[PDB]
Design a protein around this ligand. Structure first.
Ligand SMILES: Nc1ncnc2c1ncn2[C@@H]1O[C@H](COP(=O)(O)OP(=O)(O)O)[C@@H](O)[C@H]1O
Ligand SMILES: [Mg+2]
Lengths: 269, 15
């Protein structure tokens, strides 16, 4: 197949993952623009290939305005191309760094959209496993712009509230206690990560952090976080409450996305 | 503690 190289012109870099690069591209026949996630595949093992197919398959199964849309999946000689609709506002990560933190209003709006994209995965039997601000993209730079869930590279399927050992994977600061404890897990891990994200939205830094990654994981497994003054003095108890429910160490006790979209701090507006 | 990028890991081990 040369199906990509002669149907698309590649443009500039939009971002980078662990071993992928995402470039803007333009379909030649139409002049329509897309984001091409490019993976060098001569490097890859059989398992990795399967993960790529799984990523494509799961993306397609999801249709939501807050989930990125996969337009094509093309395998060439030394490269695989996943062509997605272009989301032009950059990563949520960049916006938080750019603004330092979101007001309680903006943060509420933002986490509402994230939780909606997550709950959509969950009701469709998918756990993403890698919720973080780098994998959430903004429809544009404008306050309250639409947030889109990206990066289904680690996503897997699980039914309902079932939990099994799906392996050690995710992003360190966002990893849940049950993954770190190597206990069986399920959809609940994404809510933990959303709890981390919401804390980040509110003060601009994460609740779990250490230069020593061993201590980091220990802090996470213990659920050891606080709300340091003065950053958190202005923040309402109602918001802190929601973070606390999302950051509940025992996944069985943990709030679900469905009943998180009910929380007063998100709804009482 | 500060907001910095973090790379995704996958050490597998699924059973
Ligand atoms: N649809 C898109 N539109 C614009 N930029 C994108 C799009 N999809 C991904 N990106 C950029 O590429 C980066 C890597 O995308 P991802 O899907 O996260 O690859 P990985 O699975 O390698 O992390 C994202 O952090 C984002 O900055
Ligand atoms: Mg990513």
């Amino acid at each position: 197949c040369t199906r990509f190289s002669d149907n698309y012109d590649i443009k500039e870099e939009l971002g980078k993952g662990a071993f992928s690069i995402v470039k803007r591209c333009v379909q030649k026949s139409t002049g329509f623009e897309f984001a091409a996630k490019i993976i060098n595949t001569k490097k890859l093992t059989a398992r990795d290939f399967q993960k790529l197919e799984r990523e494509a398959r799961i993306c397609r199964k999801l249709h939501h305005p807050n989930i990125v849309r996969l337009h094509d999946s093309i395998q060439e000689e030394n490269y695989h191309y996943l062509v997605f609709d272009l989301v032009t506002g950059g990563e949520l990560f960049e916006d938080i760094v750019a603004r330092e933190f979101y007001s309680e209003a903006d943060a509420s709006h933002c986490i509402q959209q994230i939780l909606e994209s997550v709950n959509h995965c969950h009701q469709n039997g998918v756990v993403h496993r890698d919720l973080k601000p780098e994998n959430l993209l903004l429809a544009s730079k404008a306050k309250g712009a639409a947030v889109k869930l990206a990066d289904f590279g680690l996503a897997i399927e699980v039914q309902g509230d079932h939990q099994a050992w799906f392996g050690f994977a995710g992003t360190p600061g966002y990893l849940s206690p049950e993954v770190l404890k190597k206990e069986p897990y399920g959809k609940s891990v994404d809510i933990w990560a959303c709890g981390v994200i919401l804390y980040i939205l509110l003060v601009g830094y994460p609740p779990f952090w250490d230069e020593d990654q061993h201590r980091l994981y220990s802090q996470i497994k213990a659920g050891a976080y606080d709300y340091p003054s003065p950053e958190w003095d202005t923040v309402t108890p109602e918001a802190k409450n929601l973070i606390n429910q999302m950051l509940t160490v025992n996944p069985n006790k943990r709030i679900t996305a469905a009943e998180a979209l009910k929380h007063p701090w998100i709804c009482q507006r | 503690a500060t907001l910095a990028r973090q790379d995704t890991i996958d050490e597998g081990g699924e059973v």
